[PDB]
């Protein structure tokens, strides 16, 4: 998920 | 009987002494000492001084960094513009009128200043909702084979404007009204007065449900699912320390986002509710000023949580503030 988490500015 | 009333207002003070004046006409220094009007102005000063740089910098830095203009950031930008409306249409106007001790722009100045002040914080509110929906959609993959892109990001933005007009526009037309509130230096929706001519009561319910409960539910569900999806993934992933870190920061962040939303709309909710079910009772000008103190400061803490604490935004900001290098 880290890829989508990065996109969302969450991680 | 707790206050004195007029064609366009309600002053939270008794006229039994004959001292009460139109908030559109003369100073309110019987509602509160003048230094308290200064303090209110001092507070408005703080929020502009902090609210403007940090929100404007957001727009500016987006202009300078290509990696920032992406569909998922569109709503974050919308939050910044929303905050700016709050800063100019609300905070400065209030700085100005507070220094007169009354709302010097009159009934039409009240409508305008009230409309923009309301439009701003409502766009900001629904922005926080839309953001959550998107993050839910993108991270939780609830739809199969669906990829979020430019055309969805536009609608999300547009949807917050339709929602915000669905809130701010009606009092201009006779469903509720805008009137000076609190110390009567600033105008807002009349949720506290049972003014039957404008149907204030059916509006405060519709406000409470559509513009509070819906947002609260959506934001809890969406972020709830996320802290689920991410905790699930880490438990199935434990050989990855990075996936472990991620699930830890995303949770902390969701706690901050959720607490922050409450600190902003709960006082306005708790007070609107209490007045509705407390109707015989008397509510002072400063007390009505409190839930407003809370909702307005969001124009500062929201972009700190949602922008400065966002890794990508913060970096570009440190680059830009640091004169291009670092
Ligand atoms: C808070 O309470 C005060 C006191 O009740 C109230 O202020 C009063 O308002 C009336 C206006 O409605 C003022 O009446 C005027 O007084 C002066 C005399 O000094 C005259 O200019 C006026 O005379 C005209 O009107 C009269 C009838 O309306 C006629 O008799 C006359 O022939 C003229 O047509 C008028 O009498 C009054 O002076 C003030 N009093 C004070 C102390 O300010 C105020 O309106 C209340 N606050 C709110 C928000 O309503
Ligand atoms: C930062 C912007 C400050 C703008 C000007 C504020 C001016 C307040 O102005 C004062 O209001 C009084 C009533 O309260 C009047 O009696 C005074 O005559 C008037 O000078
Ligand atoms: C490019 O490298 C410029 C770098 C240094 C910027 C230093 C800025 C310090 C700002 C301190 C706070 C100033 C405003 C205080 C207002 C009350």
PDB file of C-alpha atoms in Angstrom, chain B residues 24-295:
ATOM      1  CA  UNK B  24     -25.236  48.402  12.716  1.00  0.00           C
ATOM      2  CA  UNK B  25     -25.259  51.877  14.361  1.00  0.00           C
ATOM      3  CA  UNK B  26     -23.260  52.440  17.568  1.00  0.00           C
ATOM      4  CA  UNK B  27     -20.709  50.648  19.839  1.00  0.00           C
ATOM      5  CA  UNK B  28     -21.649  47.628  21.932  1.00  0.00           C
ATOM      6  CA  UNK B  29     -19.409  48.442  24.943  1.00  0.00           C
ATOM      7  CA  UNK B  30     -22.295  47.492  27.200  1.00  0.00           C
ATOM      8  CA  UNK B  31     -22.035  43.884  25.864  1.00  0.00           C
ATOM      9  CA  UNK B  32     -18.339  43.859  26.755  1.00  0.00           C
ATOM     10  CA  UNK B  33     -15.594  46.252  27.908  1.00  0.00           C
ATOM     11  CA  UNK B  34     -13.645  47.911  25.125  1.00  0.00           C
ATOM     12  CA  UNK B  35     -10.382  46.028  25.944  1.00  0.00           C
ATOM     13  CA  UNK B  36     -12.264  42.841  25.211  1.00  0.00           C
ATOM     14  CA  UNK B  37     -13.040  44.346  21.806  1.00  0.00           C
ATOM     15  CA  UNK B  38      -9.315  44.947  21.373  1.00  0.00           C
ATOM     16  CA  UNK B  39      -8.554  41.371  22.414  1.00  0.00           C
ATOM     17  CA  UNK B  40     -11.006  40.108  19.906  1.00  0.00           C
ATOM     18  CA  UNK B  41      -9.137  42.296  17.401  1.00  0.00           C
ATOM     19  CA  UNK B  42      -5.827  41.016  18.708  1.00  0.00           C
ATOM     20  CA  UNK B  43      -7.148  37.504  18.108  1.00  0.00           C
ATOM     21  CA  UNK B  44      -8.212  38.412  14.562  1.00  0.00           C
ATOM     22  CA  UNK B  45      -4.676  39.819  14.156  1.00  0.00           C
ATOM     23  CA  UNK B  46      -3.083  36.485  15.158  1.00  0.00           C
ATOM     24  CA  UNK B  47      -5.189  34.520  12.700  1.00  0.00           C
ATOM     25  CA  UNK B  48      -4.322  36.783   9.772  1.00  0.00           C
ATOM     26  CA  UNK B  49      -0.651  36.925  10.683  1.00  0.00           C
ATOM     27  CA  UNK B  50      -0.487  33.129  10.853  1.00  0.00           C
ATOM     28  CA  UNK B  51      -3.390  32.264   8.558  1.00  0.00           C
ATOM     29  CA  UNK B  52      -2.263  34.211   5.490  1.00  0.00           C
ATOM     30  CA  UNK B  53       1.387  33.263   5.131  1.00  0.00           C
ATOM     31  CA  UNK B  54       0.844  29.611   5.683  1.00  0.00           C
ATOM     32  CA  UNK B  55      -2.168  29.342   3.424  1.00  0.00           C
ATOM     33  CA  UNK B  56      -0.841  31.563   0.720  1.00  0.00           C
ATOM     34  CA  UNK B  57       2.562  29.873   0.813  1.00  0.00           C
ATOM     35  CA  UNK B  58       0.700  26.665  -0.012  1.00  0.00           C
ATOM     36  CA  UNK B  59      -0.662  28.156  -3.248  1.00  0.00           C
ATOM     37  CA  UNK B  60       2.675  29.707  -4.028  1.00  0.00           C
ATOM     38  CA  UNK B  61       4.801  26.623  -3.467  1.00  0.00           C
ATOM     39  CA  UNK B  62       2.401  24.613  -5.661  1.00  0.00           C
ATOM     40  CA  UNK B  63       3.135  27.090  -8.436  1.00  0.00           C
ATOM     41  CA  UNK B  64       6.921  26.526  -7.921  1.00  0.00           C
ATOM     42  CA  UNK B  65       6.983  22.688  -7.653  1.00  0.00           C
ATOM     43  CA  UNK B  66       5.761  20.493 -10.508  1.00  0.00           C
ATOM     44  CA  UNK B  67       5.557  17.374  -8.381  1.00  0.00           C
ATOM     45  CA  UNK B  68       2.862  19.069  -6.333  1.00  0.00           C
ATOM     46  CA  UNK B  69       0.258  19.549  -8.987  1.00  0.00           C
ATOM     47  CA  UNK B  70      -1.448  16.218  -9.040  1.00  0.00           C
ATOM     48  CA  UNK B  71      -5.157  15.253  -8.836  1.00  0.00           C
ATOM     49  CA  UNK B  72      -4.870  14.099  -5.187  1.00  0.00           C
ATOM     50  CA  UNK B  73      -3.481  17.492  -4.193  1.00  0.00           C
ATOM     51  CA  UNK B  74      -6.301  19.452  -5.863  1.00  0.00           C
ATOM     52  CA  UNK B  75      -8.526  19.248  -2.764  1.00  0.00           C
ATOM     53  CA  UNK B  76      -5.620  20.288  -0.504  1.00  0.00           C
ATOM     54  CA  UNK B  77      -5.289  23.387  -2.633  1.00  0.00           C
ATOM     55  CA  UNK B  78      -9.029  23.951  -2.304  1.00  0.00           C
ATOM     56  CA  UNK B  79      -8.582  23.861   1.490  1.00  0.00           C
ATOM     57  CA  UNK B  80      -5.971  26.643   1.171  1.00  0.00           C
ATOM     58  CA  UNK B  81      -8.282  28.902  -0.930  1.00  0.00           C
ATOM     59  CA  UNK B  82     -11.140  28.191   1.474  1.00  0.00           C
ATOM     60  CA  UNK B  83      -8.909  29.235   4.357  1.00  0.00           C
ATOM     61  CA  UNK B  84      -8.055  32.417   2.469  1.00  0.00           C
ATOM     62  CA  UNK B  85     -11.734  33.360   2.121  1.00  0.00           C
ATOM     63  CA  UNK B  86     -11.913  32.878   5.902  1.00  0.00           C
ATOM     64  CA  UNK B  87      -8.842  35.109   6.271  1.00  0.00           C
ATOM     65  CA  UNK B  88     -10.038  38.019   4.070  1.00  0.00           C
ATOM     66  CA  UNK B  89     -13.837  37.856   4.043  1.00  0.00           C
ATOM     67  CA  UNK B  90     -13.973  37.187   7.751  1.00  0.00           C
ATOM     68  CA  UNK B  91     -10.872  37.730   9.896  1.00  0.00           C
ATOM     69  CA  UNK B  92      -9.941  41.194   8.490  1.00  0.00           C
ATOM     70  CA  UNK B  93     -13.494  42.505   8.320  1.00  0.00           C
ATOM     71  CA  UNK B  94     -13.826  41.407  11.922  1.00  0.00           C
ATOM     72  CA  UNK B  95     -10.495  43.098  12.814  1.00  0.00           C
ATOM     73  CA  UNK B  96     -11.820  46.260  11.372  1.00  0.00           C
ATOM     74  CA  UNK B  97     -15.365  46.267  12.822  1.00  0.00           C
ATOM     75  CA  UNK B  98     -14.165  45.060  16.191  1.00  0.00           C
ATOM     76  CA  UNK B  99     -12.165  48.316  16.393  1.00  0.00           C
ATOM     77  CA  UNK B 100     -15.424  50.286  16.023  1.00  0.00           C
ATOM     78  CA  UNK B 101     -17.211  48.159  18.660  1.00  0.00           C
ATOM     79  CA  UNK B 102     -19.966  47.239  16.157  1.00  0.00           C
ATOM     80  CA  UNK B 103     -20.688  46.051  12.620  1.00  0.00           C
ATOM     81  CA  UNK B 104     -20.167  49.205  10.671  1.00  0.00           C
ATOM     82  CA  UNK B 105     -21.041  47.779   7.313  1.00  0.00           C
ATOM     83  CA  UNK B 106     -24.763  47.519   8.045  1.00  0.00           C
ATOM     84  CA  UNK B 107     -27.346  44.822   7.116  1.00  0.00           C
ATOM     85  CA  UNK B 108     -26.050  44.331   3.542  1.00  0.00           C
ATOM     86  CA  UNK B 109     -22.478  44.321   4.810  1.00  0.00           C
ATOM     87  CA  UNK B 110     -23.712  41.666   7.208  1.00  0.00           C
ATOM     88  CA  UNK B 111     -25.087  39.453   4.429  1.00  0.00           C
ATOM     89  CA  UNK B 112     -21.907  39.671   2.357  1.00  0.00           C
ATOM     90  CA  UNK B 113     -19.447  39.291   5.190  1.00  0.00           C
ATOM     91  CA  UNK B 114     -21.593  36.499   6.578  1.00  0.00           C
ATOM     92  CA  UNK B 115     -21.938  34.744   3.223  1.00  0.00           C
ATOM     93  CA  UNK B 116     -18.193  34.747   2.512  1.00  0.00           C
ATOM     94  CA  UNK B 117     -17.210  33.842   6.067  1.00  0.00           C
ATOM     95  CA  UNK B 118     -19.669  30.943   5.866  1.00  0.00           C
ATOM     96  CA  UNK B 119     -18.740  29.938   2.303  1.00  0.00           C
ATOM     97  CA  UNK B 120     -15.071  29.783   3.301  1.00  0.00           C
ATOM     98  CA  UNK B 121     -15.250  27.544   6.352  1.00  0.00           C
ATOM     99  CA  UNK B 122     -17.837  25.351   4.666  1.00  0.00           C
ATOM    100  CA  UNK B 123     -15.652  24.746   1.602  1.00  0.00           C
ATOM    101  CA  UNK B 124     -12.878  23.984   4.079  1.00  0.00           C
ATOM    102  CA  UNK B 125     -15.213  21.560   5.904  1.00  0.00           C
ATOM    103  CA  UNK B 126     -16.344  19.668   2.825  1.00  0.00           C
ATOM    104  CA  UNK B 127     -12.753  19.663   1.620  1.00  0.00           C
ATOM    105  CA  UNK B 128     -11.861  17.686   4.731  1.00  0.00           C
ATOM    106  CA  UNK B 129     -14.740  15.348   3.884  1.00  0.00           C
ATOM    107  CA  UNK B 130     -13.842  14.911   0.180  1.00  0.00           C
ATOM    108  CA  UNK B 131     -10.172  14.323   0.981  1.00  0.00           C
ATOM    109  CA  UNK B 132     -11.160  11.460   3.273  1.00  0.00           C
ATOM    110  CA  UNK B 133     -13.478   9.903   0.661  1.00  0.00           C
ATOM    111  CA  UNK B 134     -10.683   9.966  -1.924  1.00  0.00           C
ATOM    112  CA  UNK B 135      -8.064   8.547   0.420  1.00  0.00           C
ATOM    113  CA  UNK B 136     -10.568   5.837   1.277  1.00  0.00           C
ATOM    114  CA  UNK B 137     -11.207   5.139  -2.433  1.00  0.00           C
ATOM    115  CA  UNK B 138      -7.498   5.176  -3.403  1.00  0.00           C
ATOM    116  CA  UNK B 139      -6.000   3.282  -0.456  1.00  0.00           C
ATOM    117  CA  UNK B 140      -8.845   0.895   0.411  1.00  0.00           C
ATOM    118  CA  UNK B 141      -9.601  -0.007  -3.230  1.00  0.00           C
ATOM    119  CA  UNK B 142     -13.372  -0.495  -2.563  1.00  0.00           C
ATOM    120  CA  UNK B 143     -14.094  -0.386  -6.286  1.00  0.00           C
ATOM    121  CA  UNK B 144     -12.401  -2.880  -8.589  1.00  0.00           C
ATOM    122  CA  UNK B 145     -10.086  -1.757 -11.393  1.00  0.00           C
ATOM    123  CA  UNK B 146     -10.684   1.935 -10.622  1.00  0.00           C
ATOM    124  CA  UNK B 147      -7.957   4.572 -10.859  1.00  0.00           C
ATOM    125  CA  UNK B 148      -8.373   8.077  -9.460  1.00  0.00           C
ATOM    126  CA  UNK B 149      -7.441  10.842 -11.867  1.00  0.00           C
ATOM    127  CA  UNK B 150      -7.817  14.439 -12.954  1.00  0.00           C
ATOM    128  CA  UNK B 151     -11.534  14.275 -13.765  1.00  0.00           C
ATOM    129  CA  UNK B 152     -12.524  12.876 -10.363  1.00  0.00           C
ATOM    130  CA  UNK B 153     -10.368  15.415  -8.555  1.00  0.00           C
ATOM    131  CA  UNK B 154     -12.216  18.255 -10.287  1.00  0.00           C
ATOM    132  CA  UNK B 155     -15.645  16.931  -9.253  1.00  0.00           C
ATOM    133  CA  UNK B 156     -14.454  16.506  -5.665  1.00  0.00           C
ATOM    134  CA  UNK B 157     -13.495  20.191  -5.648  1.00  0.00           C
ATOM    135  CA  UNK B 158     -16.743  21.195  -7.404  1.00  0.00           C
ATOM    136  CA  UNK B 159     -18.780  19.049  -5.001  1.00  0.00           C
ATOM    137  CA  UNK B 160     -17.456  21.074  -2.037  1.00  0.00           C
ATOM    138  CA  UNK B 161     -18.659  24.309  -3.694  1.00  0.00           C
ATOM    139  CA  UNK B 162     -22.132  22.909  -4.295  1.00  0.00           C
ATOM    140  CA  UNK B 163     -22.203  21.710  -0.700  1.00  0.00           C
ATOM    141  CA  UNK B 164     -20.909  25.039   0.622  1.00  0.00           C
ATOM    142  CA  UNK B 165     -23.458  27.036  -1.395  1.00  0.00           C
ATOM    143  CA  UNK B 166     -26.128  24.617  -0.169  1.00  0.00           C
ATOM    144  CA  UNK B 167     -25.227  25.966   3.272  1.00  0.00           C
ATOM    145  CA  UNK B 168     -24.227  29.660   2.799  1.00  0.00           C
ATOM    146  CA  UNK B 169     -26.705  30.608   0.010  1.00  0.00           C
ATOM    147  CA  UNK B 170     -30.079  29.878   1.760  1.00  0.00           C
ATOM    148  CA  UNK B 171     -29.877  32.613   4.462  1.00  0.00           C
ATOM    149  CA  UNK B 172     -29.410  35.189   1.683  1.00  0.00           C
ATOM    150  CA  UNK B 173     -32.783  33.962   0.414  1.00  0.00           C
ATOM    151  CA  UNK B 174     -34.974  33.573   3.513  1.00  0.00           C
ATOM    152  CA  UNK B 175     -33.989  30.207   4.949  1.00  0.00           C
ATOM    153  CA  UNK B 176     -32.426  31.362   8.176  1.00  0.00           C
ATOM    154  CA  UNK B 177     -30.616  34.748   7.932  1.00  0.00           C
ATOM    155  CA  UNK B 178     -27.274  36.506   8.532  1.00  0.00           C
ATOM    156  CA  UNK B 179     -27.146  38.646  11.671  1.00  0.00           C
ATOM    157  CA  UNK B 180     -24.362  40.074  13.842  1.00  0.00           C
ATOM    158  CA  UNK B 181     -23.377  37.451  16.414  1.00  0.00           C
ATOM    159  CA  UNK B 182     -21.659  37.391  19.784  1.00  0.00           C
ATOM    160  CA  UNK B 183     -20.099  40.776  20.389  1.00  0.00           C
ATOM    161  CA  UNK B 184     -21.904  41.726  17.157  1.00  0.00           C
ATOM    162  CA  UNK B 185     -18.718  42.532  15.288  1.00  0.00           C
ATOM    163  CA  UNK B 186     -19.093  39.666  12.859  1.00  0.00           C
ATOM    164  CA  UNK B 187     -22.039  38.065  11.083  1.00  0.00           C
ATOM    165  CA  UNK B 188     -23.066  34.383  10.983  1.00  0.00           C
ATOM    166  CA  UNK B 189     -26.034  32.059  10.513  1.00  0.00           C
ATOM    167  CA  UNK B 190     -28.784  32.587  13.039  1.00  0.00           C
ATOM    168  CA  UNK B 191     -29.058  29.214  14.694  1.00  0.00           C
ATOM    169  CA  UNK B 192     -29.842  30.625  18.140  1.00  0.00           C
ATOM    170  CA  UNK B 193     -33.063  32.550  17.551  1.00  0.00           C
ATOM    171  CA  UNK B 194     -36.448  31.098  16.697  1.00  0.00           C
ATOM    172  CA  UNK B 195     -37.213  33.525  13.951  1.00  0.00           C
ATOM    173  CA  UNK B 196     -40.206  31.947  12.309  1.00  0.00           C
ATOM    174  CA  UNK B 197     -40.367  34.332   9.397  1.00  0.00           C
ATOM    175  CA  UNK B 198     -37.170  32.780   7.978  1.00  0.00           C
ATOM    176  CA  UNK B 199     -37.754  29.227   9.356  1.00  0.00           C
ATOM    177  CA  UNK B 200     -34.590  29.261  11.455  1.00  0.00           C
ATOM    178  CA  UNK B 201     -35.477  25.995  13.131  1.00  0.00           C
ATOM    179  CA  UNK B 202     -35.804  23.711  10.114  1.00  0.00           C
ATOM    180  CA  UNK B 203     -32.511  25.177   8.901  1.00  0.00           C
ATOM    181  CA  UNK B 204     -30.554  24.481  12.089  1.00  0.00           C
ATOM    182  CA  UNK B 205     -31.711  20.846  11.888  1.00  0.00           C
ATOM    183  CA  UNK B 206     -30.751  20.647   8.233  1.00  0.00           C
ATOM    184  CA  UNK B 207     -27.421  22.249   9.188  1.00  0.00           C
ATOM    185  CA  UNK B 208     -26.939  19.862  12.077  1.00  0.00           C
ATOM    186  CA  UNK B 209     -27.665  16.799   9.966  1.00  0.00           C
ATOM    187  CA  UNK B 210     -26.377  17.544   6.451  1.00  0.00           C
ATOM    188  CA  UNK B 211     -23.432  19.831   7.338  1.00  0.00           C
ATOM    189  CA  UNK B 212     -22.393  18.179  10.573  1.00  0.00           C
ATOM    190  CA  UNK B 213     -23.606  14.562  11.046  1.00  0.00           C
ATOM    191  CA  UNK B 214     -23.019  13.513   7.407  1.00  0.00           C
ATOM    192  CA  UNK B 215     -19.461  15.006   7.530  1.00  0.00           C
ATOM    193  CA  UNK B 216     -18.789  13.376  10.900  1.00  0.00           C
ATOM    194  CA  UNK B 217     -20.001   9.978   9.757  1.00  0.00           C
ATOM    195  CA  UNK B 218     -18.220   9.959   6.381  1.00  0.00           C
ATOM    196  CA  UNK B 219     -14.930  11.137   7.965  1.00  0.00           C
ATOM    197  CA  UNK B 220     -15.125   8.440  10.645  1.00  0.00           C
ATOM    198  CA  UNK B 221     -16.056   5.665   8.240  1.00  0.00           C
ATOM    199  CA  UNK B 222     -13.506   6.548   5.560  1.00  0.00           C
ATOM    200  CA  UNK B 223     -10.595   6.961   7.937  1.00  0.00           C
ATOM    201  CA  UNK B 224     -11.880   4.010   9.947  1.00  0.00           C
ATOM    202  CA  UNK B 225     -11.652   1.725   6.919  1.00  0.00           C
ATOM    203  CA  UNK B 226      -8.172   3.117   6.215  1.00  0.00           C
ATOM    204  CA  UNK B 227      -6.733   2.428   9.663  1.00  0.00           C
ATOM    205  CA  UNK B 228      -8.232  -1.000   9.133  1.00  0.00           C
ATOM    206  CA  UNK B 229      -6.845  -1.658   5.633  1.00  0.00           C
ATOM    207  CA  UNK B 230      -3.389  -0.455   6.708  1.00  0.00           C
ATOM    208  CA  UNK B 231      -3.302  -2.397   9.999  1.00  0.00           C
ATOM    209  CA  UNK B 232      -4.389  -5.499   8.083  1.00  0.00           C
ATOM    210  CA  UNK B 233      -1.633  -5.073   5.500  1.00  0.00           C
ATOM    211  CA  UNK B 234       1.071  -4.642   8.141  1.00  0.00           C
ATOM    212  CA  UNK B 235      -0.051  -7.781  10.030  1.00  0.00           C
ATOM    213  CA  UNK B 236       0.149  -9.793   6.803  1.00  0.00           C
ATOM    214  CA  UNK B 237       3.475  -8.003   6.026  1.00  0.00           C
ATOM    215  CA  UNK B 238       5.514  -8.154   9.279  1.00  0.00           C
ATOM    216  CA  UNK B 239       8.873  -9.004   7.586  1.00  0.00           C
ATOM    217  CA  UNK B 240       8.740  -5.380   6.350  1.00  0.00           C
ATOM    218  CA  UNK B 241       9.788  -2.798   8.975  1.00  0.00           C
ATOM    219  CA  UNK B 242       8.786   0.021   6.622  1.00  0.00           C
ATOM    220  CA  UNK B 243       5.222  -1.287   6.259  1.00  0.00           C
ATOM    221  CA  UNK B 244       5.224  -1.422  10.061  1.00  0.00           C
ATOM    222  CA  UNK B 245       6.301   2.228  10.334  1.00  0.00           C
ATOM    223  CA  UNK B 246       3.670   3.231   7.775  1.00  0.00           C
ATOM    224  CA  UNK B 247       0.759   1.704   9.652  1.00  0.00           C
ATOM    225  CA  UNK B 248       1.997   3.511  12.741  1.00  0.00           C
ATOM    226  CA  UNK B 249       2.203   7.012  11.181  1.00  0.00           C
ATOM    227  CA  UNK B 250      -1.059   6.655   9.265  1.00  0.00           C
ATOM    228  CA  UNK B 251      -2.870   5.810  12.499  1.00  0.00           C
ATOM    229  CA  UNK B 252      -1.347   8.718  14.428  1.00  0.00           C
ATOM    230  CA  UNK B 253      -2.275  10.973  11.539  1.00  0.00           C
ATOM    231  CA  UNK B 254      -5.872   9.719  11.490  1.00  0.00           C
ATOM    232  CA  UNK B 255      -6.137  10.376  15.232  1.00  0.00           C
ATOM    233  CA  UNK B 256      -4.880  13.951  14.723  1.00  0.00           C
ATOM    234  CA  UNK B 257      -7.221  14.504  11.770  1.00  0.00           C
ATOM    235  CA  UNK B 258     -10.195  13.151  13.658  1.00  0.00           C
ATOM    236  CA  UNK B 259      -9.559  15.021  16.925  1.00  0.00           C
ATOM    237  CA  UNK B 260      -8.876  18.211  14.935  1.00  0.00           C
ATOM    238  CA  UNK B 261     -12.201  17.949  13.138  1.00  0.00           C
ATOM    239  CA  UNK B 262     -13.971  17.560  16.452  1.00  0.00           C
ATOM    240  CA  UNK B 263     -12.207  20.496  18.111  1.00  0.00           C
ATOM    241  CA  UNK B 264     -13.460  22.595  15.199  1.00  0.00           C
ATOM    242  CA  UNK B 265     -17.137  21.658  14.763  1.00  0.00           C
ATOM    243  CA  UNK B 266     -18.051  20.172  18.135  1.00  0.00           C
ATOM    244  CA  UNK B 267     -18.479  23.469  20.021  1.00  0.00           C
ATOM    245  CA  UNK B 268     -20.633  24.865  17.242  1.00  0.00           C
ATOM    246  CA  UNK B 269     -22.567  21.605  17.276  1.00  0.00           C
ATOM    247  CA  UNK B 270     -22.814  21.267  21.069  1.00  0.00           C
ATOM    248  CA  UNK B 271     -23.939  24.866  21.464  1.00  0.00           C
ATOM    249  CA  UNK B 272     -26.445  24.813  18.562  1.00  0.00           C
ATOM    250  CA  UNK B 273     -27.898  21.604  20.043  1.00  0.00           C
ATOM    251  CA  UNK B 274     -28.013  22.910  23.619  1.00  0.00           C
ATOM    252  CA  UNK B 275     -29.727  26.143  22.578  1.00  0.00           C
ATOM    253  CA  UNK B 276     -32.245  24.226  20.480  1.00  0.00           C
ATOM    254  CA  UNK B 277     -33.314  21.996  23.366  1.00  0.00           C
ATOM    255  CA  UNK B 278     -32.694  24.728  25.993  1.00  0.00           C
ATOM    256  CA  UNK B 279     -34.786  27.390  24.284  1.00  0.00           C
ATOM    257  CA  UNK B 280     -35.943  29.293  27.332  1.00  0.00           C
ATOM    258  CA  UNK B 281     -32.449  30.242  28.581  1.00  0.00           C
ATOM    259  CA  UNK B 282     -30.150  33.214  28.090  1.00  0.00           C
ATOM    260  CA  UNK B 283     -26.854  33.040  26.205  1.00  0.00           C
ATOM    261  CA  UNK B 284     -24.304  35.856  26.585  1.00  0.00           C
ATOM    262  CA  UNK B 285     -22.251  37.520  23.808  1.00  0.00           C
ATOM    263  CA  UNK B 286     -18.842  36.022  24.836  1.00  0.00           C
ATOM    264  CA  UNK B 287     -20.333  32.499  25.212  1.00  0.00           C
ATOM    265  CA  UNK B 288     -21.583  32.744  21.609  1.00  0.00           C
ATOM    266  CA  UNK B 289     -18.090  33.900  20.719  1.00  0.00           C
ATOM    267  CA  UNK B 290     -16.491  30.588  22.006  1.00  0.00           C
ATOM    268  CA  UNK B 291     -17.573  28.013  19.366  1.00  0.00           C
ATOM    269  CA  UNK B 292     -16.572  30.695  16.826  1.00  0.00           C
ATOM    270  CA  UNK B 293     -13.067  31.037  18.356  1.00  0.00           C
ATOM    271  CA  UNK B 294     -12.733  27.261  17.746  1.00  0.00           C
ATOM    272  CA  UNK B 295     -14.027  27.027  14.164  1.00  0.00           C
TER     273      UNK B 295
END
